[PDB]
Scaffold this motif. Sequence first.
Motif, PDB file in Angstrom:
ATOM      1  N   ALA D 200       0.821  -1.202   0.000  1.00  0.00           N
ATOM      2  CA  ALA D 200       0.000   0.000   0.000  1.00  0.00           C
ATOM      3  C   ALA D 200       0.858   1.256   0.000  1.00  0.00           C
ATOM      4  CB  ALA D 200      -0.946  -0.009   1.195  1.00  0.00           C
ATOM      5  N   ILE D 201       1.981   1.242   0.723  1.00  0.00           N
ATOM      6  CA  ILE D 201       2.812   2.444   0.710  1.00  0.00           C
ATOM      7  C   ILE D 201       3.499   2.615  -0.643  1.00  0.00           C
ATOM      8  CG2 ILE D 201       4.540   3.747   1.953  1.00  0.00           C
ATOM      9  CD1 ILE D 201       3.980   2.025   4.374  1.00  0.00           C
ATOM     10  N   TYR D 202       3.844   1.514  -1.318  1.00  0.00           N
ATOM     11  CA  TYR D 202       4.335   1.602  -2.691  1.00  0.00           C
ATOM     12  C   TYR D 202       3.275   2.182  -3.613  1.00  0.00           C
ATOM     13  CZ  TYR D 202       8.545  -1.173  -1.798  1.00  0.00           C
ATOM     14  OH  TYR D 202       9.761  -1.625  -1.350  1.00  0.00           O
ATOM     15  N   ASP D 203       2.024   1.750  -3.443  1.00  0.00           N
ATOM     16  CA  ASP D 203       0.925   2.330  -4.203  1.00  0.00           C
ATOM     17  C   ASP D 203       0.840   3.832  -3.981  1.00  0.00           C
ATOM     18  OD1 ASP D 203      -1.739   2.077  -5.721  1.00  0.00           O
ATOM     19  OD2 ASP D 203      -2.385   2.949  -3.818  1.00  0.00           O
ATOM     20  N   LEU D 209       3.060  10.499  -5.317  1.00  0.00           N
ATOM     21  CA  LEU D 209       4.331  11.185  -5.490  1.00  0.00           C
ATOM     22  C   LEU D 209       4.928  11.001  -6.877  1.00  0.00           C
ATOM     23  CD1 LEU D 209       5.904  10.272  -2.047  1.00  0.00           C
ATOM     24  CD2 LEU D 209       5.302  12.577  -2.798  1.00  0.00           C
ATOM     25  N   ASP D 210       4.306  10.185  -7.725  1.00  0.00           N
ATOM     26  CA  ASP D 210       4.791   9.926  -9.079  1.00  0.00           C
ATOM     27  C   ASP D 210       6.223   9.399  -9.080  1.00  0.00           C
ATOM     28  OD1 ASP D 210       2.375  10.652 -10.251  1.00  0.00           O
ATOM     29  OD2 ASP D 210       2.970  12.756 -10.450  1.00  0.00           O
ATOM     30  N   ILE D 211       6.566   8.581  -8.091  1.00  0.00           N
ATOM     31  CA  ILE D 211       7.858   7.906  -8.049  1.00  0.00           C
ATOM     32  C   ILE D 211       7.684   6.552  -8.724  1.00  0.00           C
ATOM     33  CG2 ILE D 211       9.677   6.978  -6.606  1.00  0.00           C
ATOM     34  CD1 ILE D 211       9.053   9.010  -4.530  1.00  0.00           C
ATOM     35  N   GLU D 212       8.315   6.378  -9.882  1.00  0.00           N
ATOM     36  CA  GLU D 212       8.206   5.114 -10.598  1.00  0.00           C
ATOM     37  C   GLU D 212       9.075   4.021  -9.997  1.00  0.00           C
ATOM     38  OE1 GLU D 212       6.145   4.206 -12.979  1.00  0.00           O
ATOM     39  OE2 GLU D 212       5.162   6.166 -12.900  1.00  0.00           O
ATOM     40  N   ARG D 213       9.998   4.369  -9.106  1.00  0.00           N
ATOM     41  CA  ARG D 213      10.881   3.401  -8.459  1.00  0.00           C
ATOM     42  C   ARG D 213      10.927   3.679  -6.962  1.00  0.00           C
ATOM     43  NH1 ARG D 213      11.451   3.142 -13.420  1.00  0.00           N
ATOM     44  NH2 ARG D 213      12.849   1.751 -14.583  1.00  0.00           N
ATOM     45  N   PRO D 214       9.827   3.442  -6.251  1.00  0.00           N
ATOM     46  CA  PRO D 214       9.827   3.682  -4.805  1.00  0.00           C
ATOM     47  C   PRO D 214      10.780   2.738  -4.097  1.00  0.00           C
ATOM     48  CG  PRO D 214       7.593   3.409  -5.666  1.00  0.00           C
ATOM     49  CD  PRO D 214       8.530   2.936  -6.722  1.00  0.00           C
ATOM     50  N   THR D 215      11.308   3.198  -2.968  1.00  0.00           N
ATOM     51  CA  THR D 215      12.264   2.415  -2.203  1.00  0.00           C
ATOM     52  C   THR D 215      11.980   2.550  -0.711  1.00  0.00           C
ATOM     53  OG1 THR D 215      14.619   1.933  -1.889  1.00  0.00           O
ATOM     54  CG2 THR D 215      13.974   4.243  -2.045  1.00  0.00           C
ATOM     55  N   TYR D 216      12.746   1.784   0.066  1.00  0.00           N
ATOM     56  CA  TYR D 216      12.542   1.732   1.506  1.00  0.00           C
ATOM     57  C   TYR D 216      12.759   3.085   2.159  1.00  0.00           C
ATOM     58  CZ  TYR D 216      12.096  -3.324   1.614  1.00  0.00           C
ATOM     59  OH  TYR D 216      11.653  -4.612   1.446  1.00  0.00           O
ATOM     60  N   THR D 217      13.685   3.893   1.644  1.00  0.00           N
ATOM     61  CA  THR D 217      13.881   5.220   2.216  1.00  0.00           C
ATOM     62  C   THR D 217      12.622   6.062   2.072  1.00  0.00           C
ATOM     63  OG1 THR D 217      14.696   6.374   0.256  1.00  0.00           O
ATOM     64  CG2 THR D 217      16.236   4.949   1.432  1.00  0.00           C
ATOM     65  N   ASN D 218      11.976   6.000   0.907  1.00  0.00           N
ATOM     66  CA  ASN D 218      10.724   6.722   0.712  1.00  0.00           C
ATOM     67  C   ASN D 218       9.634   6.200   1.639  1.00  0.00           C
ATOM     68  OD1 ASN D 218      11.579   6.446  -2.747  1.00  0.00           O
ATOM     69  ND2 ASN D 218      12.034   8.153  -1.368  1.00  0.00           N
ATOM     70  N   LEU D 219       9.524   4.873   1.758  1.00  0.00           N
ATOM     71  CA  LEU D 219       8.505   4.305   2.634  1.00  0.00           C
ATOM     72  C   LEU D 219       8.716   4.759   4.073  1.00  0.00           C
ATOM     73  CD1 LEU D 219       8.482   0.605   1.339  1.00  0.00           C
ATOM     74  CD2 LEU D 219       7.358   2.605   0.333  1.00  0.00           C
ATOM     75  N   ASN D 220       9.961   4.689   4.544  1.00  0.00           N
ATOM     76  CA  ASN D 220      10.273   5.086   5.909  1.00  0.00           C
ATOM     77  C   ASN D 220      10.046   6.574   6.113  1.00  0.00           C
ATOM     78  OD1 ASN D 220      11.087   2.448   5.808  1.00  0.00           O
ATOM     79  ND2 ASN D 220      13.274   2.883   6.016  1.00  0.00           N
ATOM     80  N   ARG D 221      10.288   7.388   5.083  1.00  0.00           N
ATOM     81  CA  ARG D 221      10.001   8.814   5.200  1.00  0.00           C
ATOM     82  C   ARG D 221       8.513   9.056   5.399  1.00  0.00           C
ATOM     83  NH1 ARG D 221      14.977  11.296   4.028  1.00  0.00           N
ATOM     84  NH2 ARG D 221      15.940  10.407   2.152  1.00  0.00           N
TER      85      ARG D 221
END
Lengths: 50, 128, 430, 430, 431, 431
Positions: D200-203, D209-221
């Motif tokens: 869900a956080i990747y979604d 945020l229009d991030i085509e390559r989400p990562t753990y740093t983004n999720l944790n932020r």
Amino acid sequence: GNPVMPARNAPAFCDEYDRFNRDVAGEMNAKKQQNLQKKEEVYAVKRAEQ
Amino acid sequence: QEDTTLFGYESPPDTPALHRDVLKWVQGLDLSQSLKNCRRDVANGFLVAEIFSRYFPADIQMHSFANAASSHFKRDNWTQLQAFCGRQGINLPGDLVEGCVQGVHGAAIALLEHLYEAFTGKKVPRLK
Amino acid sequence: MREVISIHIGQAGIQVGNACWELYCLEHGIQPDGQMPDDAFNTFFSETGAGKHVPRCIFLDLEPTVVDEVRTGTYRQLFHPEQLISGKEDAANNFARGHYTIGKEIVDLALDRIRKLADNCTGLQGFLVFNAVGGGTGSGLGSLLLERLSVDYGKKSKLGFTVYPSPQVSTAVVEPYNSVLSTHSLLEHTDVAVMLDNEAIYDICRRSLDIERPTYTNLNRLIAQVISSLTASLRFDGALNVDITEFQTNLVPYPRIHFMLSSYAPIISAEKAYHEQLSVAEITNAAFEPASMMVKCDPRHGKYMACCLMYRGDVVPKDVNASVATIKTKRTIQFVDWCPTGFKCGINYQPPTVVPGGDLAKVQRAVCMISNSTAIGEIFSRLDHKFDLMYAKRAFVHWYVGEGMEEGEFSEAREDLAALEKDFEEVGAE
Amino acid sequence: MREVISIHIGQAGIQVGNACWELYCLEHGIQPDGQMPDDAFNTFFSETGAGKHVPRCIFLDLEPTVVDEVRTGTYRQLFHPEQLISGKEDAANNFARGHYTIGKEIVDLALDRIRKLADNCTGLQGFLVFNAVGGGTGSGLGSLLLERLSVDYGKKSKLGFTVYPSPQVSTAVVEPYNSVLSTHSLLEHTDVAVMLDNEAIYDICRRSLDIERPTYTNLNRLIAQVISSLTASLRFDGALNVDITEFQTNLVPYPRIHFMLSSYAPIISAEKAYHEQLSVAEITNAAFEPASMMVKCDPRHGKYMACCLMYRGDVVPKDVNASVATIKTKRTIQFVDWCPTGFKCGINYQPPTVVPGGDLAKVQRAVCMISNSTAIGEIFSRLDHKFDLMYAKRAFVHWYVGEGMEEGEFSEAREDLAALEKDFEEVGAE
Amino acid sequence: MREIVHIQGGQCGNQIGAKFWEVVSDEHGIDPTGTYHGDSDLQLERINVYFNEATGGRYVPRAILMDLEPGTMDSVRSGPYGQIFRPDNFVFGQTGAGNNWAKGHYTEGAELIDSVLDVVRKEAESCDCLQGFQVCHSLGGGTGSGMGTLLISKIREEYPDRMMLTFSVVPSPKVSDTVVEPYNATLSVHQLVENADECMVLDNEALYDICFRTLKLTTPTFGDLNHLISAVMSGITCCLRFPGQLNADLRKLAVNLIPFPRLHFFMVGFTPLTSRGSQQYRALTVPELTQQMWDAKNMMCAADPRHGRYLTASALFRGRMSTKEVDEQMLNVQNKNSSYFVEWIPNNVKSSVCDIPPKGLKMSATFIGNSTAIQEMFKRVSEQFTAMFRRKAFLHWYTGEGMDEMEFTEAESNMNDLVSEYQQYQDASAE
Amino acid sequence: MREIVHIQGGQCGNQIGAKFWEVVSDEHGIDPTGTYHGDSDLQLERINVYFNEATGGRYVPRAILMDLEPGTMDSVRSGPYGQIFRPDNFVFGQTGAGNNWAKGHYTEGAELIDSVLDVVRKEAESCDCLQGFQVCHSLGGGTGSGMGTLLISKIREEYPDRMMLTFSVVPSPKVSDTVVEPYNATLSVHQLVENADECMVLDNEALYDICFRTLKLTTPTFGDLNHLISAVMSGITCCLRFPGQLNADLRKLAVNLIPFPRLHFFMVGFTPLTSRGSQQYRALTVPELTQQMWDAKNMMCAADPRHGRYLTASALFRGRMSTKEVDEQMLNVQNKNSSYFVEWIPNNVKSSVCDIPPKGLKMSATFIGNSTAIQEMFKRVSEQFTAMFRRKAFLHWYTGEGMDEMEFTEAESNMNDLVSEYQQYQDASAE
Ligand SMILES: Nc1nc2c(ncn2[C@@H]2O[C@H](COP(=O)(O)OP(=O)(O)OP(=O)(O)O)[C@@H](O)[C@H]2O)c(=O)[nH]1
Ligand SMILES: Nc1nc2c(ncn2[C@@H]2O[C@H](COP(=O)(O)OP(=O)(O)OP(=O)(O)O)[C@@H](O)[C@H]2O)c(=O)[nH]1
Ligand SMILES: Nc1nc2c(ncn2[C@@H]2O[C@H](COP(=O)(O)OP(=O)(O)O)[C@@H](O)[C@H]2O)c(=O)[nH]1
Ligand SMILES: Nc1nc2c(ncn2[C@@H]2O[C@H](COP(=O)(O)OP(=O)(O)O)[C@@H](O)[C@H]2O)c(=O)[nH]1
């Protein structure tokens, strides 16, 4: 150096002065006055913000 | 293991109410306040103080006790009460006193029954 | 003419004496070296031909550190060098050590200096003995000195401002032992004993003065203020003057019952000041509040026998009468059946002086309430079981025996304290 | 006075703690060295006499790599060196390894440091436990730590921000196993469990945020922003303050039902920022969007029991009341019939600070919607068949047995999760 | 020389009390430092009703601030008039009541109630003659409702004869702030019925409606609502503080308002509330004030008086006005709306006149209405309480604080009986 | 003016004493040449407790070094502070005791003991007032334990009333340096029980654990352990050397600590011991010092107090501190851990406060605990001694130096009786 000996720039460290001071009531009273003034200033700032 | 909770909600113990002889004894004894709820009205220990004062006027004085909801004042009332009970010879159980100050269900009821036995001619509460 | 001889025994005695003499010097304008830029100092100071005033005090201790602190502090030129008396070995929290072995030569020299001091006083209201019940120096040496004073001086009024152990908090382990011994000693020697508890004064400082970290200096400042208010009628004039001899005659219903609860009011910091009226009625109510007691002893438990009030500052007999009438009508405060009046009001026109650097504010009115009430038996009840709980195993009994005591002394002290409990219960009961 | 102790267990816990503490340092102006160029930091930082601020946090892990990354990175002078606690052997995604064999000494040391931390807090609102349900360390050691905290501290509110395995996407194989084990463990210990899913956080990151390559740093932020919004009422004043004790009281209807969906709004990049009004009503609607859930669990399937709204920034009670009235009038949003109010609104005057280098924009308004709803039973339903599908073959069960577990533990965990399913069905039903 | 002891409870109560003390200090010309700067004899004439004189010229409000969390009174002390209050009158705990009436009434309220009663007694004994106590707080909050009800019970025990005044912010009908508002309101109403002599009901949504429709404000914060509440709270007691052509104190208002002891709930409103634009177009006349006064929009309570029947209504007017004009207006209102007034009382209006209007306003008027309309408010709160109590949601928080489940039923029964009495006197017929 | 005579025995005792004198000279501002460079009045105020004035400004420590091999004293003399000691105070033999208590107590200790007592008498007669003697040495070594017990007995005979304080390095539980450690310890403990008024147990493994866990020193030298011991040895007597808010001398500590004469063994610890990494992170408050102080890992004796029961505990705090804060902390510790404190003593705490903290530290606190946990250490020593003595291994050396075998039995019986007393007071119940 001695492990018990605190390093400089530590909360534990005190110079040769401020040791042998032997004055607790005066220090607490001065700290109390400073805290009261700081608290009044903080309240003034919050009042200005509101 | 089978549980009786409503999703962890445990209903209060729902202890049985006081005996009629105990209630009649309390009512007949002259008290400024009334037993509406046993737990609430006995936790402070002021009503017990008045009962002990009525049975022993010189020993227990109303001024030593304070009608306050605080744990400190409740403990002071109950501790001086226990001191007088020990000095006289009356058996005031400490576990019942602590349950009463903490508002444990049934503790004040049992304490009132014990006092009614100690005072009112040992008229054993009709049980079973 | 109205001289009062001050004795300070032990670390606690000397440390409260520092505060007391600082307060007296500030009140009379006497600089710490001794001289100031009428005759109101005569109660506490004797003036020399050179104009320098020397206090009529004696600092007694078996440990040199506390006395040498005074010898090196600001008040090195004030006190008499021989008036400062120092021992060689400490009493080590041992009543036997301070009463039988070390205390002998020290008390002999102390009586010598006390003779010399009293010979310089035309009149003599009495002695103010400040010691530490709960320490070998204060308990043992103080008890021996009090016994010698009773022997030689006789009928002079000895007011002992003793510090008893607190109920739960304490600093010593043999404190119940030497406290019981000293209480047995001073039951029959002091004329009026004032109980003080560090726990109660700490609570006063924390609640009233908003000091989250109270210390011995603050405690001693409060005690010194109490003593100055007590002695104010001797030095400064006012309506309803009260004397040291009158303290007894209006306070001690029976010779055995002479222990006193003390309370000062108001206790407010500078910040909290000038926000309340501080009327006579309000300060009297604060003095009668149980939290304001300087003893961990709730007065509601017992009944007041006598209450002596020392008012300082702009206080009118109208206001004191109204306040005391309200206090009498109060249901929470209860007096014994055999004392209809039970009140001794005394007003003075000198407001309480403020020690610079302290926490007490400048208040135009002050009350010192010293009361005989039977509730004081509670603290003796606490010490009586704290004593016997240790005495069952005879813990630390060999320490006391080694300096020339016997198990019979412990038994006698415990039985005497039990008898004091019984007397308190009897006078409380109708 | 409002201290909250943070615990970060396992790789995910530490990696979201890194973002959380970066965010807190930015919010309170604390430089990474430790000190800043009032008393709002007391919730997360304890200040020393030197002026340097140290967080009240504990990084717990059985693997050395994650903790050494913190010890080497920028915040090496910030965190307490001993508070960083490191194991020698990893839990190897094994609940038994992290709960019975390796976790013992580590949890002993963790409780020691946690006691030292709580001794430094005047008040204590509670504990914020950040673990990863689906890994041996986070599940096993986290469960053991939660049990010990329940035993010793008792009634202190522990809020567990757990990350369950996503419905379809996952990175471990024994993830259903240790997830079921830890769920059985923490059903009875944590006070409020906030549910999070990586899918869900990747979604959210991809769509909003229009991030085509989400990562753990983004999720944790994102998670850090959510936790900061939750704790904002503790540190900054505003109308309708919410307390840690108040979350449980206004969010937990029954002790078993304390799992909560979390949603943040707005989630917009600076590119898309300042291009919509971002009114209070619009951000409330966005928070109630089923896409804005951080758990792959459609709220339309279930019914809301309670919804706590946390507003940050320029928010006015008229607007929050209007938005909540619109939400109530809305038909698709469905509440349980026994909760007529079902809303706990709380506003804060501090807008959310923006992390430099992050994708979130500087928005003057923000909402954190944390809701108790019966739809959350769906995720447990997914794990309940993912578990038994392997458990029928007893695949990977010998791994758990080797480190001091039994078939009974698995059976009990499965039965407890079935009981939780039945409880969610019953609370949903009339 | 008839003193009033003000008590503030909870976050909402403290904010309302701070606004009230600011407004009263403005009305009496008192600066936040305590000095008088009003240049008017009447302002200092009866300043002792609310204030006490310190050692200097400083005036300290006779206010006592209650809370279980220190943040709210930290905000109070940071407020515009945070410095007038005596620092000793700030009584605070350390852990707030989490919107839990049980926590604020039994567990955490028990310890701090010692300090609260001690401060109350210290303030009360200093009073020469005591009209009574007034407590401002919000129903539907943990520390506020719980500690306020406990303190009101204690004060009723200590001073039965002294007047008791309550300004309770009842939870709003449509938009509720906290989930457990119905529990807290139900538990607080049971205490207020038994203990409070005079109680006034305020609703945040009703205040929003009045400030959106009459004042036409676009962004009304809590400050504006507290401002209106402060206006009503001052206007009810302005007769004590100022000379009046027909003066009427709190006890007189209670006597003329309360027909039966349990029916002591009132809805209040303030006039003239005029939008800034229409201030020039509106003409300040006694008929205009009465027209706004009796408009159901002017009530600060959610319940509209049209549904119920006015048992009684007191109207305190302020300003240079004709007693004939006021009395004729009230009689004309009664005759025109006789359907909305109870028949078995020949005159349902207690009119009072004071000569001192609020600063800037040539005239003003505050209204205190005892009507059976409040029945629908209690009915709605009971509708929510029963819905939650049937499934026993959030009941465990109250149970874990040592509250019997029987207490909830007792409070609900008392509230329902109050509703029943209101209906009985709504449909009671003469002879 | 209450002097203390320091004595060092054996290699371990000599090293510890050298480190201790270095620490005290630093604390009083004495350079290794003995001249005063301390820059404070209080330092010279009570310097006579440990030092004597030389011809010039030099200060000679009142220390006596005793050994049977000259190597340790040569190393100490060549060390940084080897020149302060008076050369006449170095009493050494020529053939060292081969870890043999018999050689150190009967054969070779006999000849050197006359010179040792001569030096001790010369030092003691120079003292105006003598508090007593402090002897630092190691149990489990030949010369150290041998002449330590011998000299302690002789000084007890000469000066019965004068205080005896001992710092004995009891052989460590797990790692043993020499084989005959249990024999030497068994022979020495029996002597200490009869003679030493106050005995302080130190274990090298406990020191290693504390400096590896709290200090996080990874490879600690013997100098580090000696310096921790030196800090404790200074802090135990700092109340004699500096003014204190509530001072307590050695005799006061002994009276408040020792309930019965045979129960005079104590475990000690020093605070605050901080690792270099966390020094900026740790904030020094009295609660923090007490929290570190009551921790079992902080104890310098291997026995952990959790197993036993605290008979008594004295804590000497140092620094500008609140007596209320200290007393509240100690009372709270007692209340929280009442299960670990003996019931028939209402207050198991002797709190002392000195106003002069050590160099570099804002605040410090030295702890001295008398608890029944020492039972397990003596039990372990007896477990090793009995195992060795059943087969009489290494017994022939002690036999050939001239003690009867019955001495071993008597020493073991005395140690077992001490263990029995500790267990008795561990499980004693009030009333
Ligand atoms: N109120 C108050 N009490 C104090 C103060 N100083 C010491 N005490 C008390 O005094 C008691 C011991 O006093 P002393 O007997 O004089 O101590 P000492 O001077 O070392 O003499 P010994 O203990 O007898 O060896 C302690 O239990 C303290 O409670 C003080 O400054 N104020
Ligand atoms: N949301 C989020 N989840 C993460 C992150 N890092 C790891 N995870 C999740 O955490 C789970 C495992 O975490 P840990 O148990 O701590 O891994 P570990 O530290 O090696 O410990 P063990 O796996 O138990 O041996 C994985 O299944 C991931 O889904 C992260 O940065 N953000
Ligand atoms: N009129 C007004 N109402 C408020 C204010 N602050 C809070 N409230 C309302 O008061 C209700 C109860 O909150 P409150 O009792 O103060 O919380 P507590 O202090 O923890 O008991 C909430 O529903 C709020 O909507 C305010 O400043 N003014
Ligand atoms: N803490 C410490 N312990 C030591 C030191 N030197 C020796 N020891 C220990 O003391 C124990 C006894 O040795 P010791 O008595 O000095 O030998 P002796 O002089 O020949 O009798 C040995 O087991 C050593 O481990 C030292 O400098 N510091």
